[PDB]
Amino acid sequence: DAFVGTWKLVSSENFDDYMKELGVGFATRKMGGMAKPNCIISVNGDVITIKTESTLKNTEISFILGQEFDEVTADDRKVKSTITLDGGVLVQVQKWDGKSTTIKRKREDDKLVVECVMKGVTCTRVYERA
């Protein structure tokens, strides 16, 4: 839709602070911090697939909107995820150990903008079409 495509990371703000708030250790933060992943979003019927690809780590999720699923995150958290579409924004929540984090993906001009919140920290990552 507005989201379908192959996207390349072009900027990132506050990602180290976001990872630190999630409890990610130094070695993993170091690897994640200067990663420049591609994000590949596709849809077939009810099922949306988001692939995130980078030199040292790939992940993939597939989901139906509104249906909770189990996810292993790139930093190895075992979480329960739910993704919904609200005002054209894809809103993902991950829940684990009584904590949560939200990841909002939105389309703005030429940008896929991804806002990640954990407690007081807000990270913004911008992707452009590859």
Ligand SMILES: Cc1ccc(C(=O)CC(C)(C)CC(=O)O)cc1Br
């Ligand atoms: C392999 C890999 C998997 C996920 C991420 C993210 O950064 C995910 C979040 C936090 C959701 C942010 C985003 O999608 O840009 C990075 C890499 Br490298």
